[PDB]
């Protein structure tokens, strides 16, 4: 019994919610990529300007 | 006389009535056949769960 009620607390504190693990992957993912695509955009839009307008 | 008498108390406090013996193994294996199928339900689905999360 004690071992059972050890088990479940040290699942508590260590354990990973799988759930909360995979949203925060999902959210990280997305903002990667949201990230790149921001990069990629400025990269050409604030440096190509001084070259058209020549 | 005595030998008789003596026979029954020993047979009272040492032989088993097999009804409730009967009762009990009976209660038992059901006991046993239940906590194998809380197992095997706890065993695959709980934590299958999460990767059909991933």
Request: hydrophobic share 35%; no cysteine.
């Amino acid at each position: 019994n004690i071992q059972e009620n050890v088990e479940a607390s040290k699942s508590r504190i260590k354990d990973t919610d799988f759930a909360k693990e995979t949203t925060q992957l999902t959210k990280s993912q997305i903002l990667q990529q949201a990230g790149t695509s921001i990069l990629a955009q400025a990269k050409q839009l604030p440096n190509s300007a001084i070259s058209l307008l020549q």
